[PDB]
Nucleic acid binder design. Structure first.
Length: 1073
RNA sequence: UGUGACC
């Protein structure tokens, strides 16, 4: 409940010259007492009278009623920031060292010096792209500095380390003033021309870093990064994190977890000697020197100290730096520079061609329907993103312009222009428009925004490839339902004194031009073989059109902006934007390592324990018939880089016997680590989400970092959420939502009152509000209705339906309509109509919570039903598992030491249900977990129709609707749907083994009948309650269940009428991965 | 309609 208190200290800090608490209650009498109180407060305020008396008079409302929101009548003029900052600006401002960055515009020159005129200006290279101001970040940091002014012992030392660093930011800002943002949180020319171009963005990164400082080591790290980053905006992060790829090969393995035959983590007390050739030490030194040459002092020393003994026990500091390096910010170059950098491949292409065959051989040979109706599949999968050009579009009786793909496909069909048979050119005549990918530390990469003919032509084939990968282990990122802990265990598995692991970053090869030929050619060569495997007109065309996208891209041309002009240049590299990007890249990176290993074999003899491709890295574990020596590693390493060299691939290739480091994960000393570098106060690009949506994403980002090892003070995050979630009524009237409003599991949830613990309403008031918010979940959009009524639209839906099903529709048809009415949301005009409505709705809600006919059941009610039938009792669980993920907080790690961990994702889509597999053998349709959920619960005769209506043959549609399987699917669907509503795959829970024998011990559930649905939810509700108590208390409890039999039937019914909830918190989790 | 692919 501490949020509602911290909220007032904040407003009482920001505004000084009133606050009007607004309460509400599910109880009539108490509510009028709330209504009355509100009034008297407004009135007294509108007379400068003390509210102290009303707070006593209505002591009842303050005690039993629920805080809904807080009114903020501040009559200043959004200033304060100006004044406030001076106190902290006593240090000497920083002076940009305009000689550190190559490209001139990467140096912190004065804005004007980069853009002499307002028409030449562009924030494109510094835009924080977030819906929160720099001004407020400042306010937030001082608010905290104040609150912890009079701290003691260690807490003070945290304040002192921060008071300093914040001076740097303050001193440097005051020298130019505080940049003022506009209605869209953008920094325009007038305000930026004076201050250094990168002032704002750098402020954001420094504040975000200093607020995540605790230990003296943090302070040392923040300090450096904050100072060097004011001048270096391009090599800092790569410099500060480059060493880590060598360090992993230094720490010895003294016990680690491995993967067993059941594909699960298991402890192995073994020892593996880290063998490092001297040459490696030189490389690591050159890296330490490079860091030094760039100003770096403190950080290099830390790695040097650690280098004396290299103890996995002191390694934590190395990982801390590795994660901090990213918080410097994103490297946003100019489209042109980003794009500018861009006989022995016989073996390499032969592999790409064969691998492409293995993945479609069966699908093709058996005239797979997916491949036949590939075009239709492409249409249902179509998104609402960009097609490239802004077309003029007429809908019904309205002429509007859009770039959306879903729009262009409709308008084009309604005019005979729809022609997926013809795959448009992407050469000099029709240059490829470009997109960009920005990341911290790495250089900017460009992206192709190809026309939809390309998606449709690739969709089906790519989905068949992803399936082959799903059950192929070399494809780490696609294999089974596996998470990263399984990949972690596969490496450590064969590590012994007679084997060495070989990791490799191939991100620079995929972008190379030397690659584009063997690539496309290898695929095409494969598509040919496949074509000579069938005679199916449908299959050969879908397979033919795919061959055409590869040929059109062999010689592509790109539209690179160069100021306010769009130069067209011939691009001879494989960029990315295709449907086959990830799959093809994986196929390629794998064919690569296979080629390298095969080559080096001629010299040395080894065994291939494992080969893996995962994103932009690939790796292998080799076994030798003798013991590995520092001289053997060197020899293998040289011949590997040398092999990569003869292919003209600029790639980083290292060799060790204990660790590996790749973009997604890194294994040091037998343990697993995940870079904690998600930026908080700066975003890659601007989307279309709301501030509320962004508040949730910030918190979501907070959580992931925190689990990964980088923690930002939770009071700072809470502060930010207060700013971002507020709503202005007028210019002096600002409304701030309460803890109950922002954390309750509703459609407006932003974060969990307690980290790592998701609560569900267990009080009438909580339920009250919960039902209210839903009442106004989805809002209308005029523009959306108009277009949802237009001919071109209805014909699209209709045309899609008539192609899919045979008999009647409705369940499916009502779906295709909506799925299409939603895609119109990417269209800003509609997006904006929606928000405006949400705000007014929410504006009147946090003013006097409306009514609601309820009648809708949510996972909340199900649980609130069960709760009362469980008896708690103190229990004890000893710690038995050793820590394998060192950065985890303590309360989360404890859980894992007691109950264990898992290496998989709990099926939450229902794809493993027989019915879903049936509909896949005959239909290109894909029902969601929520549709299968409603379907499976229909009367036997209705299911038989649905199936046959989608093309499922009677012998099969009938053999199912009765079989044991059907009855089963019923349970498995609901199981999948419920695991979905409980976020068993996100946050903290995704880590925990919910089938731990140790955990099962603490759950005593006597069967008083035998009805699966009820047995399931009771056990789950118990496992969650037990784990939550442990997450909050550090101790365990045992749960006993005495749930009646007469109740189990009432429940079972509720169970099948659950409604899913949509919210910022929910969408934040999906946005994660 | 300051917007910019695959996922």
């Amino acid at each position: 409940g501490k949020y509602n208190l911290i909220l007032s200290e904040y407003l009482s800090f920001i505004y000084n010259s009133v606050q009007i608490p607004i309460y509400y209650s599910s109880n009539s009498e108490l509510e009028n007492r709330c209504i009355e109180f509100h009034s008297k407060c407004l009135e007294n305020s509108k007379n400068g009278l003390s509210l102290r008396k009303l707070f006593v008079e209505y002591n009842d409302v303050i005690e039993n009623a629920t805080l809904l929101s807080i009114l903020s009548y501040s009559y200043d003029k959004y200033n304060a920031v100006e004044r406030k900052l001076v106190k902290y600006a006593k240090g000497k401002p920083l002076e940009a060292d305009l000689t550190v960055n190559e490209l001139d515009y990467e140096n912190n020159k004065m804005t004007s010096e980069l853009f002499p005129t307002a028409e030449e200006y562009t924030d494109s290279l510094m835009d924080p792209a977030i819906l929160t101001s720099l001004s407020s970040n400042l306010n937030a940091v001082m608010f905290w500095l104040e609150k912890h002014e009079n701290d003691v012992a260690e807490k003070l030392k945290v304040y002192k380390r921060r008071l300093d660093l914040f001076t740097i930011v303050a001193s440097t800002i005051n020298k130019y003033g505080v940049p003022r943002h506009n209605a869209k949180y953008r920094y325009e020319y007038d305000v930026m021309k004076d201050k250094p171009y990168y002032l704002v963005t750098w402020a954001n990164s420094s504040i975000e870093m200093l607020m995540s400082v605790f230990s003296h080591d943090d302070y040392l790290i923040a300090k450096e990064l904050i100072v060097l980053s004011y001048s270096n905006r391009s090599t800092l992060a790569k410099l500060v994190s480059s060493p880590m790829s060598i360090l992993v090969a230094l720490v010895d393995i003294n016990g680690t977890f491995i993967t067993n035959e059941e594909l699960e983590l298991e402890f192995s007390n073994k020892y593996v000697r880290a063998i490092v050739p001297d040459q490696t030490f030189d490389e690591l030194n050159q890296m330490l020197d490079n860091m030094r040459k760039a100003g770096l002092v403190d950080i290099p020393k830390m790695i040097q100290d650690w280098l004396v003994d290299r103890s996995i026990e002191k390694f934590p500091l190395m990982a801390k730096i590795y994660s901090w390096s990213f918080h410097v910010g994103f490297r946003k170059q100019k489209m042109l520079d980003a794009a500018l950098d861009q006989e022995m491949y016989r073996e390499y292409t032969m592999l790409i061609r064969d691998e492409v065959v293995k993945m479609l051989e069966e699908p093709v040979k058996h005239d797979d329907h997916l491949l036949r109706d590939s075009e239709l599949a492409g249409l249902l999968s179509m998104s609402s993103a960009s097609n490239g050009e802004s077309r003029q579009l007429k809908f019904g009786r309205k002429t509007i312009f859009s770039t959306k793909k879903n729009m262009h496909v409709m308008d084009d069909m309604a005019n005979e222009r729809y022609t997926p048979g013809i795959i448009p050119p992407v050469n000099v005549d029709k240059p490829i428009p470009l997109g960009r990918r920005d990341v911290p530390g790495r250089r900017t990469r460009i992206i192709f925004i190809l026309p939809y003919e390309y998606f449709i032509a690739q969709h089906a084939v790519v989905e068949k490839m992803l399936i082959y990968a799903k059950h192929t282990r070399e494809y780490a990122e696609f294999y089974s339902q596996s998470n990263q802990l399984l990949s972690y265990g596969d490496v450590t598995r064969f590590l012994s004194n007679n084997t060495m692991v070989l990791y490799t970053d191939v991100s620079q090869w995929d972008s190379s031009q030397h690659n584009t030929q063997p690539f496309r050619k290898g695929i095409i060569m494969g598509l040919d073989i496949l074509a000579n495997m069938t005679n199916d007109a449908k299959v050969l065309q879908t397979l033919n059109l795919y061959k055409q996208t590869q040929i059109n891209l062999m010689d592509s041309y790109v539209q690179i902006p160069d100021g306010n002009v769009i130069k067209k240049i011939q691009y001879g590299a494989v960029a990315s934007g295709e449907k086959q990007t990830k799959a093809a890249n994986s196929i390629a990176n794998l064919a690569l390592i296979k080629t390298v290993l095969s080559r080096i074999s001629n010299k040395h003899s080894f065994a291939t324990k494992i080969i893996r491709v995962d994103g932009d890295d690939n790796y292998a574990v080799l076994q030798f018939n003798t013991e590995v020596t520092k001289q053997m590693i060197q020899d293998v390493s040289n011949d590997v880089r040398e092999t990569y060299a003869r292919m003209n691939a600029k790639v980083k290739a290292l060799v060790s016997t204990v660790g590996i480091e790749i973009a997604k994960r890194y294994i040091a000393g037998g343990k697993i680590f995940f870079r904690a570098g998600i930026n908080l106060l700066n975003n890659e690009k601007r989307g279309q989400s709301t501030q509320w949506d962004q508040a949730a994403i910030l918190y979501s980002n907070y959580i992931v970092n925190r689990l990964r090892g980088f923690e930002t003070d939770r009071e700072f995050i809470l502060t930010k959420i207060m700013q971002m979630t507020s709503v202005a009524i007028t210019g002096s009237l600002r409304l701030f939502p309460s803890e109950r409003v922002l954390t309750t599991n509703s459609t407006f949830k932003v974060f969990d009152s307690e980290d790592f613990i998701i609560e569900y309403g267990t009080t009438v008031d909580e339920v009250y509000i919960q039902r209210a918010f839903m009442s106004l979940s989805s809002q209308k959009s005029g523009i959306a209705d108009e277009i949802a009524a237009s001919s071109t639209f209805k014909n699209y839906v209709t045309r899609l339906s008539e192609q899919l099903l045979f008999s009647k529709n409705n369940i499916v048809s009502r779906g295709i309509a909506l799925t299409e009415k939603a895609k119109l949301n990417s269209y800003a005009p509609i997006s904006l109509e929606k928000r405006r409505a949400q705000i007014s709705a929410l504006l009147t809600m946090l003013q006097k919570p409306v009514t609601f006919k309820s009648s809708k059941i949510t996972i909340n009610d199900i649980l609130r039903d069960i709760k009362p039938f469980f008896t708690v009792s103190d229990a004890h669980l000893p710690i038995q598992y050793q820590k394998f993920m060192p950065t985890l907080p303590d309360n989360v790690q404890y859980i894992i030491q007691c109950i264990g961990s898992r290496t998989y994702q709990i099926e939450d889509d229902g794809s493993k249900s027989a019915i879903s597999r049936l509909i896949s053998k005959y239909s290109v349709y894909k029902p969601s977990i929520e549709e299968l959920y409603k379907v499976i619960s229909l009367h036997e005769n209705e299911i038989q129709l649905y199936l046959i209506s989608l093309g499922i043959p009677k012998i099969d549609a009938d053999t199912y609707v009765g079989s044991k399987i059907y009855s089963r699917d019923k349970y498995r669907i609901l199981e999948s749907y419920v695991y979905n509503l409980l976020s068993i795959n996100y946050g903290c829970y995704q880590l925990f083994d919910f089938n731990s024998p140790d955990l099962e011990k603490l759950i005593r559930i006597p069967f008083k009948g035998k009805i699966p649905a009820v047995t399931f939810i009771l056990h789950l509700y118990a496992k969650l309650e037990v784990i939550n108590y442990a997450i909050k208390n550090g101790s365990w409890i045992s749960l006993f269940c005495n749930y009646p039999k007469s109740e189990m039937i009432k429940l079972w019914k509720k169970m099948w009428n659950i409604t899913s909830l949509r919210s910022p918190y929910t969408n934040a989790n999906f946005f994660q991965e």
